[PDB]
Amino acid sequence: HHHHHLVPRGSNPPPPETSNPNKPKRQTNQLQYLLRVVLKTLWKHQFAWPFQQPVDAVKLNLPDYYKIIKTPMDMGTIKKRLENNYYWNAQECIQDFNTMFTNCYIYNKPGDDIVLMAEALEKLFLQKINELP
Ligand SMILES: CCNS(=O)(=O)c1ccc2c3c(cccc13)C(=O)N2CC
């Protein structure tokens, strides 16, 4: 039989939403600081690039990524959420950062390059979080 299951193909999931008109939203001083200070300083770091967009499991050849990670998050998504005033409070934004870092540690092993990158960025994140208004 000549059906060899070379189709249908894999794919990346739809990325997390960055707009939601019926979601409650505010601008707070903490959320402005999270954009202006926390996100933008992390974004410029040389270890930021793996985290600047949703994981492209196809390009990166990580076909098990979304088998393991069911709540993906990345700083590109977070950056757009802050720019779109998506959040109600600082906690919602911070939980996105926590999710991103947690996904990295779940999927990978201690000592992997990606984990070392996440640890460094997390250490910085936590330092900047302590200067929150
Ligand atoms: C160390 C960078 N390696 S990569 O560009 O192949 C990559 C980018 C983003 C990743 C990963 C992950 C695992 C392994 C490699 C890798 C991963 O969890 N992410 C999202 C932070």
Side-chain angles (χ1 to χ4, degrees):
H1 194 258
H2 308 308
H3 191 353
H4 292 184
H5 318 272
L6 299 166
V7 281
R9 311 293 298 174
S11 54
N12 287 310
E17 81 204 32
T18 62
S19 279
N20 182 344
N22 287 316
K23 171 174 189 307
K25 299 167 197 76
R26 323 187 278 195
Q27 296 179 66
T28 74
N29 291 322
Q30 289 178 341
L31 284 163
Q32 293 166 13
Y33 175 93
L34 281 164
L35 175 55
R36 293 191 271 201
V37 178
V38 178
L39 185 285
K40 286 185 198 206
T41 70
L42 297 195
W43 190 268
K44 287 171 155 70
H45 198 286
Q46 57 154 350
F47 293 170
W49 63 267
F51 306 97
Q52 282 173 340
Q53 60 290 308
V55 171
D56 189 340
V58 178
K59 181 187 192 169
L60 299 169
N61 308 312
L62 304 173
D64 55 356
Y65 187 81
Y66 297 109
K67 309 307 197 207
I68 296 160
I69 301 309
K70 303 314 201 184
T71 67
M73 187 52 59
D74 66 280
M75 290 205 299
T77 296
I78 296 164
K79 179 170 195 282
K80 288 212 164 63
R81 284 178 176 194
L82 291 165
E83 290 168 352
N84 295 346
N85 299 308
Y86 178 90
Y87 297 114
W88 178 258
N89 62 22
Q91 192 284 321
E92 294 180 345
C93 177
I94 290 162
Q95 184 166 161
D96 285 346
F97 276 104
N98 299 336
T99 299
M100 178 187 80
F101 291 124
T102 299
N103 295 342
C104 185
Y105 305 141
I106 291 175
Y107 182 77
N108 298 284
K109 296 191 184 304
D112 289 346
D113 275 345
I114 194 68
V115 173
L116 299 182
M117 292 169 95
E119 286 166 12
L121 290 178
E122 187 177 27
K123 166 197 178 163
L124 259 170
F125 177 72
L126 291 168
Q127 292 177 16
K128 304 259 67 155
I129 286 303
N130 279 320
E131 3 167 321
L132 199 65

